Amino acid sequence: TYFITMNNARNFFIQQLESNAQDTATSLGLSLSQSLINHDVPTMDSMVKAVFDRGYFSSIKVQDIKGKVIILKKQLPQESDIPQWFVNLIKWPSTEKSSLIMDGWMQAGVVLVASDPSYVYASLWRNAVEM
Amino acid sequence: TYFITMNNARNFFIQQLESNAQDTATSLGLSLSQSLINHDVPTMDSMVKAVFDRGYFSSIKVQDIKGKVIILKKQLPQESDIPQWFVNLIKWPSTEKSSLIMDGWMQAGVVLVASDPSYVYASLWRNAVEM
């Protein structure tokens, strides 16, 4: 039988969650351009909600140049039946990734996507085997 | 030391690659709407290239109602230093996911995203431990 060490599986999720937040922010940066320029909040909300409803993100933030937050989706990590000792073994901090929302060559806004590491803890706990 | 079985790690990637292709297709479906309506091929190409340059996809296809392919990005799985016996152990077929490109309530096109399972084989091979 073949296995993967917990340490290597953890390194995958650390890297995957970080790059997924960046890739998501970059694609939202292109997707939101026209709606941000024309101040179409409902269209911007649909694009963000489609991404945030995936469930992997702790926060998604859209703001114009000044820092004026236009859209803000947030969720907390919630209660867990995972033992705290195992949570302390695998946990790692969340990282926020950004991408500029452009209007041609001019800056128009920023979209920020933050990962939710606690989204993966339960799957690592249920699939863990000790040897 | 904690481990994950190869079978459980494989089930994760089977599920993750399939849902990632679907989530990507759905977000592209919203992102490409205005450009498809106004027939802005360069803007559509930038949105697709940002997603396809990620490297996880075997193909991304944008077409109007009729099946007229507007954008087509493809890549083959390439040569591997992975032994064929291990490739046969973990391999699984690619799946194509679709999302409609809408213009309000009217249909305008379809975007199709296909996964590339062979993208993950090398990482599973380099991280594999037998017990």
Author numbering:
A (entry chain A), B (entry chain A): 22 to 152
Can you provide the manuscript's text about this entry?
LapD is a c-di-GMP receptor that translates changes in the concentration of this cytosolic second messenger into cell-surface events via an inside-out signaling mechanism that ultimately controls cell adhesion. Specifically, c-di-GMP-bound LapD engages the periplasmic protease LapG through its Per-Arnt-Sim (PAS)-like domain, preventing it from cleaving the cell surface-bound large adhesin LapA, a protein mediating cell adhesion to multiple substrates. In contrast, c-di-GMP-unbound LapD adopts an autoinhibited conformation and loses its affinity for LapG. To address these shortcomings, we report here two structures, that of the output domain of a LapD ortholog from L. pneumophila, also known and referred to here as CdgS9, and that of LapG in complex with the same output domain.
The structure of L. pneumophila CdgS9Output (residues of 22–152) was determined from data collected on a crystal grown from selenomethionine-derivatized protein by using single anomalous dispersion (SAD) phasing (see ‘Material and methods’). The asymmetric unit contains one molecule of CdgS9Output, which adopts a PAS-like domain fold with the highest structural homology to CitA. A potential biologically relevant dimer involves a crystallographic symmetry mate, burying 3020 Å2 surface area at the twofold symmetry axis via favorable interactions (estimated ΔGint = −20.2 kcal/mol). The protomers form a parallel dimer, with the termini lining up at one end of the complex, consistent with their connectivity to the transmembrane helices that flank the periplasmic domain. CdgS9Output adopts a ‘parallel’ conformation as opposed to the open, V-shaped form that we observed in case of LapDOutput. As a consequence, the tryptophan residues (W125 in P. fluorescens LapD; W126 in L. pneumophila CdgS9) that form the distal tip of the PAS fold and appear to be a main anchor point for LapG binding are farther apart in the P. fluorescens dimer than the L. pneumophila LapD ortholog (50 Å vs 35 Å between their respective Cβ positions). Taken together, the cross-linking data clearly indicate that the topology observed in the CdgS9Output structure represents the biologically relevant model, which is conserved in the two LapD orthologs, LapD and CdgS9, despite only moderate overall sequence conservation (31% identity/52% similarity). In the apo-state, the output domain dimer of CdgS9 contains central four-helix bundles, either via packing of helices α1 and α2 of the PAS domain fold close to the distal end, or helices α1 and α4 at the membrane-proximal region. Closer to the membrane, a cluster of 4 phenylalanine residues (2 per protomer; F33 and F34 of CdgS9) stack in a perpendicular fashion, as opposed to the packing near the distal tip, which involves the burying of two symmetry-related arginine residues (R75 of CdgS9). High-affinity LapG binding to the off-state of LapD is prevented by an apparent surface mismatch.
